Amino acid sequence: KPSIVILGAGYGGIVAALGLQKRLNYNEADITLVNKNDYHYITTELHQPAAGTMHHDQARVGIKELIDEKKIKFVKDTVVAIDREQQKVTLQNGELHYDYLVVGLGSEPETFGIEGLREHAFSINSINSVRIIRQHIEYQFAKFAAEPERTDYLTIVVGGAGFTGIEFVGELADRMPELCAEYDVDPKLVRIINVEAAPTVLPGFDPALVNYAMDVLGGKGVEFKIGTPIKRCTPEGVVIEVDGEEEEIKAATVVWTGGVRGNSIVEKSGFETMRGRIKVDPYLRAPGHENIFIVGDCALIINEENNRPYPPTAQIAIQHGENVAANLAALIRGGSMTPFKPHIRGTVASLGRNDAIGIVGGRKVYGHAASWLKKLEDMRYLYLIGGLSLVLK
Amino acid sequence: KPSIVILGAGYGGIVAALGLQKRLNYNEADITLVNKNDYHYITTELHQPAAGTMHHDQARVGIKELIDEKKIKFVKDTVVAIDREQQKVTLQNGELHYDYLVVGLGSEPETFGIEGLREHAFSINSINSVRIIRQHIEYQFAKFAAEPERTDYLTIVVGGAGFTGIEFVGELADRMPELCAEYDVDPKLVRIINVEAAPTVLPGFDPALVNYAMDVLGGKGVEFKIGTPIKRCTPEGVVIEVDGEEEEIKAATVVWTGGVRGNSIVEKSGFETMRGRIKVDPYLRAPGHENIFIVGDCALIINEENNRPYPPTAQIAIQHGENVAANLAALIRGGSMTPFKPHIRGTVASLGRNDAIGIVGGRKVYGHAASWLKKLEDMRYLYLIGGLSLVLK
Ligand SMILES: Cc1cc2nc3c(=O)[nH]c(=O)nc-3n(C[C@H](O)[C@H](O)[C@H](O)COP(=O)(O)OP(=O)(O)OC[C@H]3O[C@@H](n4cnc5c(N)ncnc54)[C@H](O)[C@@H]3O)c2cc1C
Ligand SMILES: Cc1cc2nc3c(=O)[nH]c(=O)nc-3n(C[C@H](O)[C@H](O)[C@H](O)COP(=O)(O)OP(=O)(O)OC[C@H]3O[C@@H](n4cnc5c(N)ncnc54)[C@H](O)[C@@H]3O)c2cc1C
């Protein structure tokens, strides 16, 4: 009984565990799955509960529900540290020893050292976090009617105009009429501001899609400030740099979607990391460790054709998990391992419940078609981990 | 030709207005109804939206929906002052001149000068105030899962154990299970604490009802501190006096149901007031103005028999409205009619969705009987102002 420990029941981890579960028969390996919570949250949907456009219970599933307690032992606790020499993982309430290790601890926010961002701005990275964002915004809107002078209650600043930020502002723009109606609020006073340091919205994207997104969101009232970095974050708003001079936006809500880095546990444990991530070998392993595998957002891979890194996505995390399960199963039975090859299909970014943009199959995809394609691809992961049973819920 | 101005579209005001509408045959009175908002809220229901057990729209009705624009002209503005000498009421956005004046501006909170109570505790007195309370609480619970050490997020202190405080804690007690389900909170950690300076819960009431209420609410986990004054209020809680010594409660939410005074506008306008209220003559008029009528909570009346002052209630306010409507109609048509005679029926205090207590007619009433009696009595008012249409909504 070799011991395989998987840290984090996110996309890569939960898929790795389920893969090992399907491939292996009882008493062949001792597998323990460690997670902060007893549920797995569907991270790619987290922007919707944050906005209030979807209930949060549709973005998570109970882990014990998914797995087999015989093949996999589930442990709900928080990983604190990793000791490679002792091959021991330190939790808040315990210790674990591993023969093989899988690290899938996801991302932490990258604030680029910007002042006050960690302390005063929100992140879309968990069920807890999006519930907090949602209730915070509803609270500010409730506060406005008693204090009509505080229009900063109705100002929401979204930092970063990448995939996440765009999806979020779209959800928000969809939500605004119902929210205003709910709190007796004048829609004309509401400001949703997306602030990006880069010269363009959605950098690295097809410019047609960017223009379409900017038109749709702008029509629904989103304001874009491009080429505008956030110099500072304060409890009453953000300070940005316009034309080389400081300007202030007074906003009761600031959400940071600007960047992600690998979870700090990986770097604190002495691994060599780039942006907190590990550039793994052909069999998704930490260099100079034949027993340590890295999946999801903790893993860095470079595209062969270009020379730019693959972005941290749920899709490639899923593929990471499948490959690691197959390779570990082979490794335990003394077989040989297959190298990892990413197979990246197109991805669609929603612009609300009804609209979206994407490049699918090399072809540009707008509107309801793109929206449905996204919904379908999302349904596939659900079928993958929980089957049609999960798909119905 | 004569102009009747009614200030405040609350119980007394809206009932006086609708009554005047029914009694007069148009074109005889110029009637203007002034309100802070474009809706009339059913104040006696406000404890439920505050807790979150009922949506706030069911606790208000559009004023324009209630009245006839031909007979009554509705003005949405905020009263700033009253000039008795010039017969002019000054608004934020206007001025009005009256031949007849009906004052029903309701109550304001009385904090008795307790430090921090005004700045840091919430009050149940409007649709805005209760939306703010509800969202504040939901926000604290949402914040809890991320910071489980902060149990004070789950502590709600309700100051004053009179009618309103009891109804409110009952509503909260009903609400806690769903709320806890919503934010992944362990119900055992939730503290609902009702703090009373008086030696008993529900002071001035029959002890049977008091004991039943404490038993029911105590059963749903509400905690009572009696004989306990509130020395101070801060953003993190309250300081109370126990056994003559200061003790601290760390609470993210403090709601004050401790006392009310007449709206300060009446006192500031040079009227002679007792605790901001006017002791009116037998035709509910302010001494010694023959053209000014006072309704609702702004009016103080003494019972002839018991020689005690009457409590500020919707029931007596409604009766005020009916009486001023009849008396003003008679006054216009030269009829010279009737003095005000209060006929006070029993009142029921709800203890949640399923339970309540009261002294109705002469009999103590508990449980489903009392609950239905209260619902029936409220529906009576709904029928009074809006008919079967309003009753169905
Ligand atoms: C709004 C938003 C929308 C997105 N949309 C898309 C999309 O459409 N397509 C796409 O490909 N990608 C999308 N992504 C990216 C995708 O969500 C991530 O790339 C993916 O979740 C990373 O997978 P992961 O398993 O590595 O990490 P995670 O999904 O974040 O899982 C990490 C797990 O480990 C737990 N955990 C974290 N730290 C600890 C710790 N110390 N101890 C114990 N447990 C811990 C966490 O609770 C969590 O369960 C989106 C991301 C966001 C925020
Ligand atoms: C939770 C709670 C529960 C209650 N339950 C009961 C019960 O069960 N039975 C009972 O008999 N009584 C009950 N009461 C008491 C009852 O609600 C009040 O006594 C009654 O509403 C007061 O009559 P009113 O019309 O003068 O005041 P209000 O109902 O408060 O109306 C005053 C109106 O004036 C408006 N207004 C105020 N100031 C201004 C301004 N400067 N300018 C313009 N407009 C203004 C306000 O918008 C409001 O519409 C309860 C009270 C509370 C807080």
Residue numbers in the entry:
A (entry chain A), B (entry chain B): 3 to 395
What does the paper say about this structure?
Type-II NADH:quinone oxidoreductase (NADH dehydrogenase-2, NDH-2) is a membrane-bound dehydrogenase that oxidizes NADH and reduces quinones and is a central feature of the respiratory chain in many diverse species, but not in animals. NDH-2 is also much smaller and simpler in structure than complex I – it comprises only a single subunit and one flavin redox cofactor. All of them are homodimers, with each monomer containing two Rossmann folds that form nucleotide-binding sites for a noncovalently bound flavin adenine dinucleotide (FAD) and the NADH substrate. Our study has revealed how the NADH:quinone oxidoreduction reaction proceeds in two half reactions (NADH oxidation + reduction of the flavin, and re-oxidation of the flavin + reduction of quinone) that occur independently of each other and use spatially distinct substrate-binding sites.
